DNA sequence: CGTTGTAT
DNA sequence: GATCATACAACG
DNA sequence: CGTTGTAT
DNA sequence: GATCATACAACG
C-alpha cells in the first residue's frame, strides 16, 4: 500500500527500510537508490505483538502491512516469498525510536524467528552529532536533510547498519530477556530490572534499547518531581509562558504562540500533546488548582477548541511556582539546541505535588496522586516545622485527605485513608451527593471525572432493560444556575428510593473508585513511593534550600550595591578633586583608586556617574538607600546564621501564602 | 449525526443553530437551553448548491446532514416534518463567516424556498467588540457602536477594556449564550423574502453564486466602489458576499505591486525578521515562527500559513525563494511537519527587509492592537516580476510568471536612463518569463510581446531532449511537471498499444542527474521526432501556463497592468521609499548634530555647568537660559557621564561632528537633485543586480 | 474534469 | 501527524 | 475491557 | 481542524 518498492527482485542486494515517521519516510524515499532500496513508513508506535496470537497479529493494519511487505506469514514461512534480501529498521535516536525498534524486534523475534535467525533483520544506526558522530546534533530523522539521511543511513558505502542476530546458546537468553520486557504481566520484574541497572546480539540490543526508553519515560515524562510537583512538559509550558510575559495580570495571548514557543525553545516533541497537557492544566474540573487561565472553548465535564482559536494566560496560583525564579533559587541546564537555558526545577512556595497531584504511566511503574486542600497541607507543613517529631496520625488530623474539585462526598473510613497515606498505596472512593425533594431524588453533585451524561445514559439503559421499574421518570434539570442536577422521579411514594439509590451506587457511575500511588521523583534524583510524612518532610527540605538560596542571592546583591554606594559617597565628599582627576590625569581609573582608596568597581561606578547626579537630592537618595540596604543586609545576615530564624521565616511565608491562595474544602468526608 | 438535539418537538418555540466551527459548535452546545435549542455544527465551507441538482445537493454530506436535520427534502416539502420552529445560521464575524452565511442562504433560497418564505431562516449577528468597565459590560456589532459606548463610559471611573472578537472559537460559552443564544439578550435577525422582492432576490443571488458569469461580478465590484428584527434576504446576501469578495481581493489572493507579496507572506517574512532569523543566523523550528505569525499578525489557521511558507521555501516553486529550510521541504509535492522542519530567511529576502527601520513603509496596528505591522516592505528589486504570483479571488484572479533578476534590473535602469522607453525596447532586455525548471519556452517573441502588451495571455513550455545514441533522453521538464506522472503517462500510452515504435522506457534519474528520462526505440529506422511530437501533444512534456498580470497598484485598487506600467509604477514606489529613507537618515543626522553642538558648548564651560547643577533646583531650565540651549541639549548635558569629561571623549565627539556635517551635506545635496537621485537609484539597482544575480534558467526557443 | 493557492 | 470536502477564476 | 495522561 | 491506533501500569 504505502510501500515504495524498488525496481529489482534479486535478493542479497535488495534492502527494505522501515521508517518511523511518515515525514521521515518521505525524506528516506527522497534519498533511496530505488535500484535495490525500498522504503516503507510505519505511522506511529506499532503493537506489542509479544503476547498476541499468530492470527491476531494480522489484524493490526501496521503489522499487516509489514507482513505483506516482508512476504512472509507469522509461522515458519522460511524465505521463499521473501521480497527483500535485507530488512533494516530505521528510526531516529529518540528513546521512543528505541522503543519502536524494540517493538519491531519483539514482533520479528516472536512471529518471524526464522527470518531473524537467517540474518535478515538489520538495525540502522543514525548519527547523534554532526560537526558525523554516533556541532549540529540531529533531533530526528524528520529534521535532517535528505542527502544527510542518505549518507547517514542509506548509501551502503557510507552507512552504519548493524546486523541483529540470535545465535545458538544465546537464543535461550534472547527469549528469556525479551520476555520480561514485553510481557503485559510481570511489571514488578521490570521495576527490579530497572533498579539493578558490523553485527550485534539481538538480546544485547533489546536490553539496552528498552533501558533507554524506560529510563527516559520514568525520569523525563511520566513521573513528577517532588519539588514543584510538575512533569517536564508542564514545567516547560509554565516557564515558556513566564518568558512570554503571560502573567495573571497580563493580557491574553493566542495559545498557538505559547505552544510554538514551548516547541521552539524547550520541548523537542509534538505540538498536539503539548497543547493537550496545557488544556488539561487549564481545566478547573481537571485541575484542583489550575494554572490555568483560558479564553474560549477549553472543554467541559472532554474535548475543546483548537489552539488557533483559544487564548491563554498563567493563573495567579502559578505565581507560587514562578516567583523567586530569577533569584538564584533553581539550577539551569541548557536546552536541546544549546541556544538558551532552562530551569531544572521551579522555586515552589507550596507543595504543588500534593496540591494538584499527578497521574502518569511509565515503563515498569506509574504514579497516582490525588489533589489536596491548600490550607490543610500548609497547616500540616507548618505543624511539621513547629514540632518536627510530629507523627503521621497528627498530620492526618490536619489533612483530612484528598480534596477533589467536584464537590460530592468522599465515602472512605478515616482508618482506611490513614492506611492509604501510611503505606503510600491504596484506593479512595467517592459518591454523588443527592437529596430527596420532594419524594423524588435529585443529584446535585457528581464524583470526580464523572461524565454525568454517561451516568444518565447508564440509568436510562438500565431502565430500558426493565431492571428499574421503581423509577417512573428520569429528567435532567441541569441548567446554567445548577451545573449538575439529575432528577429521578419514582412511581408512587411507597417505593424505597434509598434502595434504588444504593443500587445506582453499585451499578452506575454515581460511585467511583480512584487509584492512589504516591510515586514521585525525590530530591535524590530517583523515583520512589513515599508516605505523607516523607513527602512533607522532603518538600520542607527543598523549600528550606530554595529559600536559603534566595536569601544568599539577595545578600550578595545588597553587599555589592553597598560597596558601590560607599564608593559613590566617597566621590561626592570630594567631587571637585574627582572631576579634576578626570580632566587632568591620563587614565583616571587607577588614579581615582590611589587618591581615595577605592576599588576598581567603585572607580568605574564613579566614572559612570551622570552630571545630573551631582545634585543634592541624589546624595540624599543615595544615603537613605545606603541606610535601608544596611538594615536589610543586617536582617538577611541574621536570618542566614540562625536555624530558628530560618524556620520561622519558612513558617511566616507558608502562613502568608496559605491565606492569599487559600480555598475551602470542596469534597467533604462521609461514610 | 453530529447533532446535539433538544428535548422538545413543540414548534414556534424550538430553535436550530447552524454553527460554523466545530469548536464554536462546542461552545454553542455548551451554552444552549436544551429545552428548545438544538445545535448542529457545519465543519468548513459548505457546497455552493445554486447550480446543483436537487438530488446532487443530498450527495454532499454537509447539505445532507442539514436536510435530515431540518426534516425537509429539497423539494416543496412544506413544513409537516419540520423538526424546528426557527433555523438560525451562526458564524463568526469573519468575511469568511459572511461567505458561509451567503452559501447557506443559497442552499436555503434555491432548495428550500418555502421554508425561507414561511420565515424560518434566521441570521445570528455576533458582537465584534466587548467593552467592560467595572461591573458594566457592553457588546457592540459595529465599530461606531463601540466608539459610542466608549464615549458614554468617559463619564464613569476610567480604564475600560476593549476585547475585539476575532471569532466564535475564542469567546467564552456564556458570552456566546448572552450574545447569540439567550432570547432575552440575543441579536438575531429574521431573513425574509417578501412578494415582489422574490424576483429581485433570485436575480441578485444568481450573479453572486453562478459558476459562470464572473465578469458580471467584476463589474458589480466595480460599481460598488443599525439593525432591526427583520431584514431582506437579498439585502443581506448582496452585502455579505460583497464583504467577502472585497476581503479576498484586497487581503488574500492579490499581491501588492510594491513588494509583490500577499498579506500572509509579508507577515511571515516580517515575523521572521522580528525573530532575528536572518540568512546568517542559525535555523529555528518552524513551529516557533508559525506560532509567532499567528500570535502576532495573522488571525487565521496554522496549516495554510505553514503551507504558504513551505511553498516560499521551495526552489522549484519559487524562482527566488525566501526561503531557507532544513529537513524535508518536499520535492518535485508534500513535505514534513512544522514540528520537525527548521527555517530561516534567504539572502534574497534582504531585498525586502533591509531599509525596514528607516521610515520607508507605513504601519498599521495588528488585530489585538498590542503590536504594529508594516503595510508594505521596502523592496529594493521588483519582486512582483521576479517571483511572480498566482491567486484566485472573487470575480478576478492573478497569474504572474517569474522573471530573471538581472534582466528586470537592467530594464528598470534602462527605464530610469530613458523614461520615454517603449514596451518593445524593454522587451529587447527582458526576454520573457524565467521559470526555475530549465527547459525551453517555445513561444514566438511576437506572441510574448502581445502577452506583455495586453497584460494577459499564455506561455507554453516544452521539455529539453537530446538523441544519444539513437535513444531519446529528456534532461529537463517544464515547470510543475511531476516527471513520475510523465513516466506514468508515456507508460500507460505504451500499455494501450499506442506506442509500438518505442521499445523501452527507462528512468535513469539519479542524484547526479535529477531528470533523466530515456526513450529507446525498436530499430533505428523509426522517426523518433514524430513520436516526440506525439508525446508533446499527449503527455505532459509540453505544458501551458496562464498569464494574467493583475495586481494591487499604488492606488490601492486591483488592476491588470502591462510590463511598462508595472516597471514604471514600481519605479515610483522605489523612488518614493528611497526618498523616505534619505529623509529619515537626514533627520537623525540633524538631531545628532544638534545634540553634539550642545555637548561641545557644555564642555567649553563645564565648571559653570556643574555649578548650575549643584546650585540650581532643577537645572534643566537654568542651563537653557544661561547658554541659550534647547531642552533636548539640556537633557543631553544632564545625561553626560563623568568619564566623558575627558579630552579623548571631546575629540571623538568633534570628529563625529565633522563626519555628521559632511554626511548631512551629502544627504541634503542628493535630496534636492533629480539627477543625483536617479544616479543613486541606478547605482543601487546595478549593485543589487550583481549580488543577487542569476543566469537564465529557461532559454527561449521555438 | 483537473489544475493552481490562501481560506474554513 | 496525514487525510478528507469545500470556495473562487479560468485555461487546457 | 475501559479507563487515565505524555508520547509516536 | 477533528479523527484514528498504538505503548505503558494497574484497578474495577
Ligand atoms: C479548517 C479545516 C476544516 O475541515 C477540513 C476538511 N474537512 C473534513 C471533511 N469534511 C467533509 C469537509 C471539511 C478538509 F477536508 C481539509 C481541511 C484542510 O486541509 C485544512 C487546512 O487547514 O489545511 C483545514 N480544514 C480542513
Ligand atoms: C504519531 C501520529 C500519527 O499517527 C497517529 C494516529 N494514527 C492514525 C491511524 N493509524 C491507524 C494509527 C496511527 C492516531 F490515531 C492518533 C495520533 C495522535 O493523536 C497524535 C498526536 O500527536 O496527538 C499523533 N499521531 C497519531
Ligand atoms: Mg523523533
Ligand atoms: Mg493526539
Ligand atoms: Mg473564523
Ligand atoms: Mg489543508
Check A309, A317, A421, A514 and give the catalytic one.
A309
List C-alpha distances in Å: A14 to A71, A91, A159, B49, B350.
14, 19, 15, 53, 47
Give the whole-angstrom CA distance, residue A509 versus residue A505.
7
Nearest CA-CA distance, residue B193 and chain A, Å: 35
Long-range contacts: A420-423, Cβ < 8 Å, 24+? A420/A516, A421/A392, A421/A396, A421/A518, A421/A531, A421/A532, A422/A392, A422/A531, A422/A532, A423/A531
Provide the grid cell at A106: 519483539
Q: Examine the residue annotation and report whether A309 is marked as an active-site residue of this protein.
A: yes
- Which residue(s) pair with B40 in the sheet? B18
Query: Taking Cα atoms as reference points, which of B135, B124, B171 lies closest to residue B26?
Result: B171
Give the whole-angstrom CA distance, residue A298 versus residue A409.
26
Give the whole-angstrom CA distance, residue A73 versus residue A646.
70
Give the whole-angstrom CA distance, residue B554 versus residue B562.
15
Q: Which fold has domain A1-197?
A: Rossmann fold (3.40.50)
Asked if B640 has any chain A CB less than 8 Å from its own CB, the reply is: yes
Interface test with A, best of B336, B344, B621 (most A CBs within 10 A): B336
B598 sits in which H/E element: helix B563-604
Query: Taking Cα atoms as reference points, which of B219, B215, B560 lies closest to residue B399?
Result: B560
List C-alpha distances in Å: A178 to A173, A190, A201, B301.
8, 11, 12, 46
The DSSP annotation for A370-408 comes to: --B-HHHHHHHHHHHHH-TT--HHHHHTT--SB--TT-S
User: Which amino acid residue places its CA nearest to atom 22 of ligand 1?
Assistant: B303
C-alpha count within 13 angstroms, C-beta hemisphere, residue A259: 30
Q: Please state whether beta strands B550-552 and B542-548 pair in parallel, antiparallel, or not at all (unpaired).
A: unpaired
Q: Please state whether beta strands A527-529 and A519-521 pair in parallel, antiparallel, or not at all (unpaired).
A: antiparallel
List, in sequence order, every beta strand (DSSP E) within B26-90: 37-41, 86-90
Quote the crossing angle between the two packed helices B286-296 and B263-274, to the nearest 10°.
110
- Gap from B345 CA to F5 C1', Å: 38
Footprint of strand E on the protein (CB under 7 A): A 20-21, 44-45, 94, 96-97, 100, 221-222, 231-234, 267, 269-270, 272-274, 276-277, 280, 286, 358-361, 449
CATH class of B1-227: alpha beta
Q: Is the CB of A45 under 6 A from ligand 2?
A: no
Query: Taking Cα atoms as reference points, which of B92, B126, B121, B83 lies closest to residue B104?
Result: B121
User: Which DSSP state fits A163?
Assistant: E
Phi, psi (5° rounding) for residue A11? -65, 175
Helix (H, G, I), strand (E, B) or coil at B677: helix
The answer to whether the CB of A442 falls within 8 A of the CB of A434 is yes
Peptide bond into A292 cis (omega under 30): yes
- In chain A, breaks (C-N over 2.5 A) are found after 131, 134, 197, 301
User: Which DSSP state fits A133?
Assistant: B
Helix (H, G, I), strand (E, B) or coil at B72: coil
Domains of chain B, residue spans: 1-227, 253-702
The answer to whether the CB of B363 falls within 8 A of the CB of B346 is no
**B488 Cβ nearer than 7 Å to chain C strand:** no
Scan for cell 495567579, then name that residue: A316
Give the whole-angstrom CA distance, residue B679 versus residue B621.
47
- Gap from B439 CA to C6 C1', Å: 29
Nearest CA-CA distance, residue A593 and chain B, Å: 14
Give the whole-angstrom CA distance, residue A623 versus residue A626.
5
Q: Please state whether beta strands A15-19 and A37-41 pair in parallel, antiparallel, or not at all (unpaired).
A: parallel
Atom of ligand 1 nearest to the CA of B307: 23
Provide the grid cell at A489: 422521579
Radius of gyration over every alpha carbon of chain A, rounded to an integer in angstroms = 32
Give the whole-angstrom CA distance, residue A536 versus residue A355.
12
Give the whole-angstrom CA distance, residue B151 versus residue B84.
41
Give the whole-angstrom CA distance, residue B172 versus residue A499.
41
- Gap from A335 CA to E6 C1', Å: 19
Phi, psi (5° rounding) for residue A609? -65, 145
Helix (H, G, I), strand (E, B) or coil at A291: coil
Q: Is A513 exposed, middle or buried (0-12, 13-18, 19+ CB in 10 A)?
A: exposed
Secondary structure of A409-463 in the HEC alphabet? EEECCHHHHHHHHHHCEEEEEEECEEEECCCCEEEEECCCCCCCHHHHHHHHHHH
Phi, psi (5° rounding) for residue A10? -70, 110
**What technique solved it?**
X-ray
Give the whole-angstrom CA distance, residue B270 versus residue B366.
13
Asked if A27 has any chain B CB less than 8 Å from its own CB, the reply is: yes
The answer to whether the CB of A307 falls within 8 A of the CB of A275 is yes
User: Which amino acid residue places its CA nearest to atom 3 of ligand 1?
Assistant: B44
Sequence-separated (6 or more) residues with CB below 8 Å from residue B519: B471, B472, B473, B474, B490, B502, B504, B505, B506, B528, B531
Asked if A180 has any chain B CB less than 8 Å from its own CB, the reply is: no
Give the whole-angstrom CA distance, residue A340 versus residue A206.
34
- Gap from B518 CA to D12 C1', Å: 26
Give the whole-angstrom CA distance, residue B661 versus residue B58.
77
Whether B26 and A270 lie within 8 Å, measured CB to CB? no
Give the whole-angstrom CA distance, residue B148 versus residue A634.
58
List, in sequence order, every beta strand (DSSP E) within A36-132: 37-41, 86-90, 121-124
Query: Taking Cα atoms as reference points, which of B265, B243, B241, B242 lies closest to residue B253?
Result: B265
Atom of ligand 1 nearest to the CA of B61: 11
Provide the grid cell at A53: 496470537
Give the whole-angstrom CA distance, residue B329 versus residue B342.
10
Provide the grid cell at B459: 506561455
Scan for cell 540562625, then name that residue: A642
Query: Taking Cα atoms as reference points, which of A218, A207, A196 lies closest to residue A173?
Result: A207
The answer to whether the CB of A578 falls within 8 A of the CB of B642 is yes
Give the whole-angstrom CA distance, residue A659 versus residue A666.
17
Give the whole-angstrom CA distance, residue B378 versus residue B357.
10
Scan for cell 429521578, then name that residue: A488
- Which residue(s) pair with B466 in the sheet? B473
**Which positions on chain E have an atom < 7 Å from some protein CB?**
3-8
The answer to whether the CB of A213 falls within 8 A of the CB of A95 is yes
Give the chain B residue nearest A34 (alpha carbons).
B510
The answer to whether the CB of B363 falls within 8 A of the CB of B372 is yes
The answer to whether the CB of A199 falls within 8 A of the CB of A162 is yes
Peptide bond into A430 cis (omega under 30): no
Helix (H, G, I), strand (E, B) or coil at A502: helix
User: Which DSSP state fits A619?
Assistant: H
- In chain B, breaks (C-N over 2.5 A) are found after 225, 332
Give the whole-angstrom CA distance, residue B606 versus residue A669.
79
Provide the grid cell at A629: 540596604
Nearest CA-CA distance, residue A576 and chain B, Å: 10
Q: What's the helix, strand, coil split of chain B in %, to 5? A: 45, 15, 40
Radius of gyration over every alpha carbon of chain B, rounded to an integer in angstroms = 32
Size of interface A-B (CB pairs under 8 A): 189
| Buried b or exposed e, range B436-473, using 16+ CB within 10 angstroms | bbbbbbebeeeebbebbeebbbebebbbbbeeeeebbb
Long-range contacts: B668-674, Cβ < 8 Å, 24+? B668/B586, B670/B582, B671/B579, B671/B582, B671/B583, B671/B586
The DSSP annotation for B83-98 comes to: --SEEEEE--SSHHHH
List C-alpha distances in Å: B412 to B384, B400, B679, B691.
13, 18, 13, 16
CB-nearest to B327 from A145, A254, A300 is: A145
Provide the grid cell at A568: 559613590
Atom of ligand 2 nearest to the CA of A44: 1
Give the whole-angstrom CA distance, residue A40 versus residue A18.
5
Give the whole-angstrom CA distance, residue B393 versus residue B438.
30
Q: Is the CB of A59 under 6 A from ligand 2?
A: no
List C-alpha distances in Å: A26 to A362, B329, B336, B380, B619.
31, 10, 8, 37, 71
Give the whole-angstrom CA distance, residue B253 versus residue B262.
7
The answer to whether the CB of A349 falls within 8 A of the CB of A357 is no
Cα B576 to chain centroid distance, Å, stands at 23
Dihedral sign from CA coordinates of B689, B692, B693, B696: negative
Peptide bond into B469 cis (omega under 30): yes
Whether A303 and B173 lie within 8 Å, measured CB to CB? no
Indicate the Cα dihedral angle B556, B559, B563, B564, nearest 10°.
-60
- Resolution (angstroms) equals 3.3
Name chain B contacts of A337, Cβ cutoff 8 Å: 282
Give the whole-angstrom CA distance, residue B517 versus residue B512.
14
CB-nearest to A612 from B170, B287, B639 is: B639
Provide the grid cell at B122: 434566521
Asked if A313 has any chain B CB less than 8 Å from its own CB, the reply is: no
Give the whole-angstrom CA distance, residue A217 versus residue A361.
9
Give the whole-angstrom CA distance, residue B243 versus residue B102.
11
Give the whole-angstrom CA distance, residue A442 versus residue A422.
37
User: Within 10 Å of residue A655's Cβ, how many Cβ atoms?
Assistant: 13
CB-nearest to B643 from A259, A263, A608 is: A608
Give the whole-angstrom CA distance, residue A60 versus residue A460.
35
Secondary structure of B403-423 in the HEC alphabet? CCHHHHHHHHHHHHHCCCCCH
Give the whole-angstrom CA distance, residue A180 versus residue A189.
7
Note the residue count of chain A: 671
Q: Ligand 1: which residues within 6 Å by Cβ?
A: B 43-44, 61, 301, 303-304
User: Within 10 Å of residue B325's Cβ, how many Cβ atoms?
Assistant: 23
Note the residue count of chain B: 702
- Which residue(s) pair with B396 in the sheet? none
The answer to whether the CB of B605 falls within 8 A of the CB of B640 is no
Nearest CA-CA distance, residue A609 and chain B, Å: 5
Scan for cell 504562540, then name that residue: A257
Give the whole-angstrom CA distance, residue B398 versus residue B435.
17
Name chain B contacts of A609, Cβ cutoff 8 Å: 641-642
- Which residue(s) pair with B190 in the sheet? B122, B230
List C-alpha distances in Å: A38 to A86, A358, A643, B1, B581.
10, 44, 69, 42, 57
Sequence-separated (6 or more) residues with CB below 8 Å from residue A249: none
The answer to whether the CB of B172 falls within 8 A of the CB of A296 is yes
User: Which amino acid residue places its CA nearest to atom 4 of ligand 1?
Assistant: B44
Whether B639 and A611 lie within 8 Å, measured CB to CB? yes
Q: Is A470 exposed, middle or buried (0-12, 13-18, 19+ CB in 10 A)?
A: middle
Sequence-separated (6 or more) residues with CB below 8 Å from residue A133: A127
- Gap from B334 CA to D3 C1', Å: 13
Give the whole-angstrom CA distance, residue B119 versus residue B116.
5
Quote the crossing angle between the two packed helices B198-209 and B233-248, to the nearest 10°.
20
Cα A219 to chain centroid distance, Å, stands at 10
Amino acid at each position: 500500500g504505502k510501500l515504495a518498492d524498488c525496481t529489482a527482485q534479486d535478493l542479497n542486494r535488495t534492502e527494505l527500510f522501515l521508517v518511523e515517521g511518515d515525514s521521515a519516510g518521505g525524506s528516506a524515499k527522497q534519498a533511496r537508490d530505488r535500484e535495490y532500496q525500498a522504503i516503507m513508513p510505519l505511522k506511529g508506535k506499532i503493537l506489542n505483538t509479544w503476547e498476541v496470537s499468530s492470527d491476531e497479529v494480522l489484524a493490526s493494519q501496521e503489522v499487516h502491512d509489514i507482513s505483506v511487505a516482508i512476504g512472509i506469514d507469522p509461522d515458519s514461512d522460511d524465505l521463499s516469498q521473501l521480497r527483500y534480501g535485507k530488512i533494516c529498521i530505521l528510526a531516529d535516536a529518540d528513546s521512543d525510536g528505541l522503543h519502536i525498534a524494540t517493538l519491531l524486534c519483539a514482533l520479528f523475534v516472536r512471529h518471524f524467528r526464522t527470518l531473524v535467525k537467517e540474518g535478515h533483520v538489520y538495525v540502522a544506526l543514525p548519527p547523534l552529532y554532526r560537526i558525523y558522530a554516533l556541532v549540529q546534533r540531529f533531533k530526528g530523522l524528520g529534521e535532517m536533510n535528505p542527502m544527510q539521511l542518505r549518507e547517514t543511513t542509506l548509501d551502503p558505502n557510507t552507512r552504519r547498519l548493524v546486523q541483529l542476530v540470535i545465535s545458538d546458546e544465546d537464543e535461550q537468553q534472547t527469549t528469556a530477556i525479551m520476555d520480561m520486557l514485553l510481557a503485559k504481566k510481570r511489571s514488578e520484574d521490570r521495576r527490579n530490572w530497572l533498579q539493578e541497572k558490523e553485527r550485534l546480539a539481538l538480546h544485547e540490543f533489546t536490553e539496552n534499547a528498552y533501558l533507554n526508553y524506560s529510563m527516559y519515560v520514568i525520569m523525563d515524562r511520566a513521573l513528577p518531581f517532588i519539588g514543584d510537583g510538575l512533569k517536564p512538559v508542564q514545567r516547560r509550558i509554565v516557564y515558556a509562558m513566564s518568558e512570554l510575559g503571560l502573567n495573571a495580570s497580563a493580557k491574553f495571548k493566542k495559545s498557538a504562540r505559547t505552544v510554538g514557543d514551548v516547541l521552539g525553545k524547550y520541548h523537542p516533541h509534538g505540538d498536539s500533546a503539548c497543547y493537550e497537557a496545557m488544556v488539561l492544566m487549564a481545566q478547573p474540573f481537571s485541575y484542583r488548582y489550575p494554572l490555568g487561565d483560558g479564553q474560549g472553548n477549553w472543554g467541559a465535564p472532554k474535548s475543546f477548541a483548537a489552539m488557533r482559536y483559544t487564548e491563554s494566560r498563567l493563573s495567579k496560583y502559578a505565581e507560587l511556582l514562578l516567583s523567586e525564579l530569577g533569584q538564584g533559587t533553581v539550577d539551569w541546564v541548557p536546552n536541546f539546541d544549546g541556544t538558551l537555558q532552562e530551569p531544572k526545577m521551579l522555586p515552589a512556595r507550596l507543595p504543588n505535588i500534593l496540591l494538584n497531584g499527578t497521574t502518569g504511566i511509565a515503563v515498569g511503574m506509574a504514579t497516582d496522586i490525588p489533589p489536596h486542600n491548600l490550607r490543610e497541607v500548609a497547616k500540616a507543613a507548618i505543624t511539621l516545622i513547629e514540632q518536627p517529631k510530629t507523627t503521621l496520625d497528627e498530620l492526618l488530623d490536619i489533612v483530612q485527605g484528598p480534596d477533589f474539585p467536584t464537590e460530592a462526598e468522599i465515602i472512605t473510613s478515616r482508618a482506611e485513608i490513614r492506611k492509604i497515606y501510611q503505606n503510600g498505596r491504596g484506593s479512595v472512593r467517592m459518591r454523588a451527593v443527592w437529596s430527596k425533594e420532594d419524594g423524588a431524588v435529585v443529584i446535585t453533585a457528581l464524583p470526580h471525572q464523572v461524565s454525568g451524561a454517561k451516568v444518565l445514559e447508564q440509568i436510562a439503559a438500565q431502565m430500558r432493560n426493565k431492571k428499574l421499574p421503581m423509577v417512573d421518570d428520569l429528567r435532567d434539570e441541569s441548567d446554567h444556575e445548577n451545573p449538575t442536577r439529575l432528577v429521578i422521579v419514582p412511581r408512587s411514594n411507597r417505593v424505597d428510593m434509598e434502595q434504588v439509590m444504593n443500587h445506582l451506587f453499585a451499578t452506575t457511575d454515581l460511585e467511583k473508585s480512584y487509584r492512589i500511588n504516591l510515586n514521585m521523583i525525590g530530591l535524590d534524583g530517583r523515583p520512589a513511593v513515599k508516605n505523607l510524612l516523607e513527602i512533607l518532610s522532603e518538600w520542607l527540605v527543598f523549600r528550606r534550600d530554595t529559600v536559603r538560596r534566595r536569601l544568599n542571592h539577595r545578600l550578595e546583591k545588597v553587599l555589592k550595591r553597598l560597596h558601590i554606594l560607599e564608593g559613590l559617597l566617597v566621590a561626592f565628599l570630594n567631587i571637585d578633586e574627582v572631576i579634576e582627576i578626570i580632566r587632568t590625569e591620563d587614565e583616571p581609573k587607577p588614579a581615582l583608586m590611589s587618591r581615595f582608596g577605592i576599588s576598581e568597581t567603585q572607580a568605574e561606578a564613579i566614572l559612570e556617574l551622570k552630571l545630573r547626579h551631582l545634585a543634592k537630592l541624589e546624595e540624599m537618595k543615595i544615603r537613605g538607600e545606603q541606610s535601608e540596604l544596611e538594615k536589610e543586609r543586617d536582617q538577611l545576615q541574621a536570618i542566614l546564621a540562625s536555624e530558628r530564624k530560618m524556620n520561622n521565616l519558612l513558617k511566616k511565608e507558608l502562613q502568608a501564602d496559605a491565606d492569599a491562595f487559600g480555598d475551602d474544602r470542596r469534597s467533604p468526608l462521609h461514610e
